Amino acid sequence: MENAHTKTVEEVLGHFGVNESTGLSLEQVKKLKERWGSNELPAEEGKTLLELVIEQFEDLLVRILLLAACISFVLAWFEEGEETITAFVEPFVILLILVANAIVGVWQERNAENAIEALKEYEPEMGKVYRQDRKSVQRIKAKDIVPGDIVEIAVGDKVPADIRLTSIKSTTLRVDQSILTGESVSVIKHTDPVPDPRAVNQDKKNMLFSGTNIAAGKAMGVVVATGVNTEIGKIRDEMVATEQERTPLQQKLDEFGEQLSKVISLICIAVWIINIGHFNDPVHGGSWIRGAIYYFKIAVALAVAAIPEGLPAVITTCLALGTRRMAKKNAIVRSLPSVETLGCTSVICSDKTGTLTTNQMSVCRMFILDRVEGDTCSLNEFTITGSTYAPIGEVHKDDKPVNCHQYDGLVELATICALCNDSALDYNEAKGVYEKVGEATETALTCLVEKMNVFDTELKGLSKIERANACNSVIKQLMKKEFTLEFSRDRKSMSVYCTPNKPSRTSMSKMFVKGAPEGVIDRCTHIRVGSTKVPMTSGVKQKIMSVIREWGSGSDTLRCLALATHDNPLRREEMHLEDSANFIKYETNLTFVGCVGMLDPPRIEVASSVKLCRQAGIRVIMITGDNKGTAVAICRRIGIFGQDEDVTSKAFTGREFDELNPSAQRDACLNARCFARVEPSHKSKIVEFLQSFDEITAMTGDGVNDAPALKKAEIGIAMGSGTAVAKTASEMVLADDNFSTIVAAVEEGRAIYNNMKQFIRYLISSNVGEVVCIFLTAALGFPEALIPVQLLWVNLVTDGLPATALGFNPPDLDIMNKPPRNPKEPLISGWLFFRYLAIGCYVGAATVGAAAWWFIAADGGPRVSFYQLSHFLQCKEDNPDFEGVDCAIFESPYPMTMALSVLVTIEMCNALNSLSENQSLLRMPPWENIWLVGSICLSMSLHFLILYVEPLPLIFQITPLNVTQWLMVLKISLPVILMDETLKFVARNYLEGISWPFVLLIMPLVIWVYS
């Protein structure tokens, strides 16, 4: 069966031997499972290891160090080419820092993919089928669907396999198949066969494809292909590498990356220029071209040192960390920019039903009319026990057990709930619980019919399975459903045209209507009291609405629904059911029967989440299509409003919002916190009004009425137990429906930006000190304190792992107390620019002072004066200004080792400053980031290694230091902490919990270094 769209519905069902009513057997499914297998696609390997490494070396900042490593190679291969001892050490230390950052980036990217893939199996994909075990619809796993079984699918569902449409229950069926054919509109389907055997998928009507969603309607069909035999499975090879747009923060770092490479080039050009007079010095052999090449290597080695080469890698691991940290909290992050954009979210619009509430509805009370005075009416208000979907409960009239058969209004109320219902109740023998098949509002009515049991049937000898739809089957055996005017959110109602099967009374067909109590009652002209009908007046209209308003605004905050019937409807011939606007024209002159109120408890984590968002400057707005009285009462429960807060201008309806010119409509959208009774058209309109104020909007939803708003918001967050239409229009999915994961995603997105600013602060405060070290030496006339191979050792030790370990920084202590960040402001602030220069100027002066100390004040070194150190090039044995000074000590490796050791040490102490922007080290000790402690101990281990290992001091032109000289290195390196603790102190006090184990740990160190 490969061309099913060209065959009649009877011909396809005959091919499988299946009936559309009873379904498929279980001896047939066992045979079909062996010949066809499970309905699932093989797992894709994704980005391979080699491809994942190539993406690390595609940024400009990494391509400079690649070219500089090539320059250092071709410049060291022409002099002493056949060598490996000291010639090719400069290109080697340039490549080690590149492969170190490439390993961390690939390993962290591989971790985020593994956590995401392990989250796809959180809850298995399910599918509704008809099988001969039960006479009702049952949920099974989508992988256990075999070709040939009857599958039922409704609005919002995801088509589990290729389905030949057998019967459409509603007036029309729309399917969103942009995933397969690429058309951005819902396609209308039918049940008639198409003649063309080679029709394209756009022309393949009467066929629903796996992976696509049902946009509107309800239908059933027979599966014709599963697994790799579906249209979306046969094209899984046509999966080209999509152009993933850069994160809006990555665009800020790319502009900053090219702006920094332009200023670094001007700095390296200046280094080669300010040293013109040193080209023909005797150190280089008196040759100009020999000295010009030497200072070209200092400029190249300074470019590698000054350029942040781990910046494209650290943004990779941070975004990869945010994805893995969210997948551990059961949150599927589809779009990479989504977790970073949530850190700047200012408004969180949220669906109420199914999103802020558990969606575990249960009809707990109802009422019918007892007797009509003529101006007022007495109501027979009942109550029902039970909070789950199990059909075990008791109906009480006045807290006394009552039987529903003696009330003819209850018999009629149960009939409307049974027939005007596109849902059912399923038993789960694996879990031992009754679960819903369809919407929660309708299954609550399906379970209510079982508890009422208006037609007293023997319900004791039936199993758990046959008790889910026992009382409903009795009602549906009495009335024959003709067609369904499906639920449309413009009228907020739904009717069903039923005909009584009994020909004895010869009753004409009726229309059983259920919907929102506000609109349905307005279309009601009569009221059903007991078994007789009496015309409705405006006095009894107030009594019915007042009870419903008490239910919604009460303590239980009930979700109400009115039930009505139409005694004399038009025939099917006169009704024009093609369009949907005529449906409200047939739901007129109704007879009000009763109203039901079902409880929908909010989720436990919602109340604490709204409190954390308000503290973080975020605003939570409830966009619901439910009643205003129910919405405001839920908002007072979850914390959006106070239990006595006035909401005269913070809660609006769809009608009240439209009856407002754009003047007041604007100033009401940023001040409101609850929108009730809004269509899917309004929800996206609310979201675009909030984006008009330059606000990052995050919409959270579960149903098809939220997909237009989920597409317009910057971030769309879908619930895991929601419809597949909402989960398709969303960037993040809460697999466990935990609303507290949203605020964790905001804290994580703010952490990605914080780790970025600390990385920038560390590689600019430090690398400026390496640039100042070279220019300060030149302006003072001192001997050069660093050679190219040592400028490349500082880059490896300081710009390597101690810089990437900043992406593992812990969140700040005030991370979620600051207002949301505006993504339009510049990356680096003007105050941060001062903090970079203030630290760098000390790092540079400390490195020059370390070399100047040995030449002037050290005991082992000469006691050379400041004049002789500044004019060291003019020293000969005939100069009376240089007496006793052996002027071969100006090339000694001691001052170059003091400067190399101070540069490395002062940058490790500057990394300890880069754990937070303003929190001191006594408040956030360095062991809160253990990846940084290990990176510093490794960098200091490698520094001590080249100082004392057999051949290495010769390769780097350094000499081993003693304990007295190492105490001097620490004397100058430690004040870089005190300088940044001071700059952090000013930012806290004048611009914007001391750990005693840390204070007591550093005091034996601080007193030792300074005596």
Ligand SMILES: Nc1ncnc2c1ncn2[C@@H]1O[C@H](COP(=O)(O)OP(=O)(O)CP(=O)(O)O)[C@@H](O)[C@H]1O
């Ligand atoms: N199957 C159904 N049949 C008839 N009326 C329904 C219905 N489902 C919901 N309604 C009613 O239509 C009204 C508005 O439609 P809507 O689809 O927006 O409700 P909803 O359950 O989605 C609230 P939310 O938007 O917060 O999820 C609801 O208040 C409800 O009373």
Ligand SMILES: [Ca+2]
């Ligand atoms: Ca560097």
Ligand SMILES: [Ca+2]
């Ligand atoms: Ca550095």
Ligand SMILES: [Mg+2]
């Ligand atoms: Mg909802």
